[PDB]
């Protein structure tokens, strides 16, 4: 299928590219320190008018 | 330093309005539980109002409910005391004061310690 013939004529031929393929998936960040104050706005003990 | 400055005092007969202002300079304004406390001529001290943090007020006097109004303004740094259907009664020094713990910073949010106060007004009410 390389030469796009039938027969094929004595030799050494290169046809194709010998590949590994990945195995999982990796994410990485440091570790996280600032967490939005959120709780203060939801868990408020008492809202303004 | 801290500055606790209000303004607003002078002599209005009664049936009248006054809106009385603090201004705050020395801290951040948002973390701190505002307070109004009168102070009657030659009497004892008596709580009046409060804003916490979030500029959600805490209730008024019992004696005092239904006249006053409190308001807050983080932006300006300023907090102001409508008051409304003055009374010859109605004369008295008045302090705005701080809290001391700061919100998040230890169960629920801290309203007490008022521990800077500053110099009063001389509101007074007269025919």
């Known amino acids: 299928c390389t030469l796009k013939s039938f027969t094929v004529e004595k030799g050494i031929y290169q046809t194709s590219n010998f590949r590994v393929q990945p195995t999982e998936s990796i994410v990485r960040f440091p570790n996280i320190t600032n967490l939005c104050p959120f709780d203060e706005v939801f868990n408020a003990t008492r809202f303004a008018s | 330093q801290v500055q606790l400055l209000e303004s607003g005092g002078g002599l209005v007969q009664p049936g009248r309005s006054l809106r009385l202002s603090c201004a705050a300079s020395?801290?951040?304004?948002?973390?701190?539980?505002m307070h109004w406390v009168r102070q009657a001529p030659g009497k004892g001290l008596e709580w009046v109002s409060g804003?916490?943090?979030?500029?959600?007020?805490?209730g008024y006097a019992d004696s005092v409910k239904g006249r006053f109004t409190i308001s807050r303004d983080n932006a300006k740094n300023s907090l102001y005391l409508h008051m409304r259907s003055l009374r010859a009664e109605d004369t008295a020094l008045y302090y705005c004061?701080?809290?001391?713990?700061?919100?998040?910073?230890?169960?629920?949010?801290?309203?007490?310690?008022?521990?800077?106060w500053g110099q009063g007004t001389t509101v007074t009410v007269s025919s």
């Open positions: 020395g801290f951040t304004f948002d973390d701190y539980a």
């Open positions: 804003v916490s943090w979030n500029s959600g007020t805490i």
């Open positions: 004061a701080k809290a001391v713990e700061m919100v998040r910073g230890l169960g629920a949010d801290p309203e007490y310690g008022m521990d800077v």
